[PDB]
Write a protein that binds this ligand. Structure first.
Ligand SMILES: NC(=O)c1ccc[n+]([C@@H]2O[C@H](COP(=O)(O)O)[C@@H](O)[C@H]2O)c1
Ligand SMILES: NC(=O)c1ccc[n+]([C@@H]2O[C@H](COP(=O)(O)O)[C@@H](O)[C@H]2O)c1
Lengths: 245, 246
């Protein structure tokens, strides 16, 4: 029936003393989800364990609204369904369809800016649910942070797509874990953004792996195999519903 | 039963395409553990064969090497077979052949099978025992058996002592090799000495970058890092269930 914020895999009581509870949010098109998108969560989990004082409590996929001005974007409920099946075996990853459900007065899909997405997660976990219980018994605000590849930081540093007020909210109140791989040179983007350099965590990608959703759609159109680039249940879903022609 | 049975449950013995020579791909490797890259290599070879050759793919076989190969990080053969089998159970065309891991000498010890003898074994089981592959014209033909390999295996063929020159001649004159070339890397010079034993060599360019090697997966496992989404979930579950890779 109606929208319920997913919590079936949210750790609501911490296990590690002295650690700040953390929730990771991946905002993207996910058209379709790939193994790289999923691997980025695991890389972020590993980095947090050994390089921060955070304790990871959940990972959320946030598929973008159908109103987003982008090519190759399948219908929102399909992208949500593909993501959900991809993370069904995961013990800690969930999909939040919130962005795909936003509608304007006339009922058309309405785009949700990333700053408003992060406030939505902040609201559901910390205001509605009461935060995360520590080993000290204190229910705390989970830190909410974005999880994105290097292209997102480069996008944030170029004027035109991000308003200064949103950038300030996103990076000063929440933060971003950024996966950086070989060949990508994000040095200039960090320079233009270094006033927030303390809520920006750059994670080196040790194993090179650059599969994009765009390449996956191309392969689907040319009748090339996408097995082992995206999860099996997503391959089946795409075939069952004839997505991406 | 307890005795060895050649797997054929996904073997296509009837062709669907006219004018095509039937082809069986054999990946000889350690698979300790199998990764998504090993599986992707079969799909890339399938894509290449369909659109760039006059072959028709009839099966893909994983052939985990004998424990007698004695290499660092080589888990027990029955474990590697189980990991490959579970990894490939959802596949429509890939199978695991435990033949190499089941080979034993007189002393009951694992006995190494050189790759040339592995290909002869596939030739024997598919073409001699089973009688080959029927074409769309109703004519029964021998399937071409060919190796599917990455660049490290091809480069090893140039390591003196490792592969007999006579085995290389059999492998490359009678069977062949589909070779995955990583993006940015140029393996042509390593190939140069090998195109001298007939040109039954097909190079498949890998456009999508992917370096998930078994060596890196073992390192991550030793350092207590996650390998989920680098290797199949059933392999992750098997490794945790049996405590493999320290
Ligand atoms: N001003 C903004 O909030 C803004 C601008 C550009 C992109 N984005 C977000 O970044 C994500 C882009 O995802 P993709 O990399 O899959 O295209 C989307 O969630 C998009 O909404 C937000
Ligand atoms: N003389 C030979 O037949 C010979 C020599 C070295 C390696 N090999 C084969 O090459 C494969 C190497 O596999 P990996 O790259 O996964 O370690 C194995 O199947 C191994 O048996 C064969």
């Amino acid at each position: 029936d109606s929208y319920t914020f997913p919590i079936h895999k949210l750790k609501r009581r911490q296990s590690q003393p002295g650690k700040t509870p953390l929730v990771l949010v991946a905002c993207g098109s996910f058209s379709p989800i790939t193994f790289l998108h999923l691997r980025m969560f695991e890389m972020a989990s590993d980095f947090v364990r050994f390089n921060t004082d955070f304790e990871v409590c959940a990972g959320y996929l946030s598929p973008v609204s159908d109103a987003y001005k982008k090519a190759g974007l399948a219908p929102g409920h399909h992208r949500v369904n593909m993501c959900s099946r991809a993370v069904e075996p995961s013990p800690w990853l969930m999909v939040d369809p919130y962005e795909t459900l936003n509608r304007n007065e006339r009922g058309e899909p309405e785009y949700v800016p990333t700053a408003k997405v992060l406030r939505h997660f902040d609201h559901e976990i910390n205001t509605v649910l009461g935060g995360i219980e520590g080993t000290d018994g204190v229910r705390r605000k989970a830190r909410i942070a974005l999880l994105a590849g290097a292209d997102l930081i480069m996008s944030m540093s170029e004027p035109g797509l991000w308003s200064p007020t949103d950038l300030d909210v996103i990076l000063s109140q929440y933060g971003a874990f950024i996966i950086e791989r070989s060949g990508t040179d994000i040095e200039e983007a960090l320079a233009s953004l270094r006033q927030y350099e303390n809520n920006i965590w750059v994670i080196s990608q040790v194993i090179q792996n650059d599969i994009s959703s765009t390449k996956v759609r191309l392969f689907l159109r040319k009748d090339l195999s996408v097995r082992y680039l995206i999860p099996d249940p997503v391959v089946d879903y795409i075939e069952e519903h004839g997505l991406y022609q």
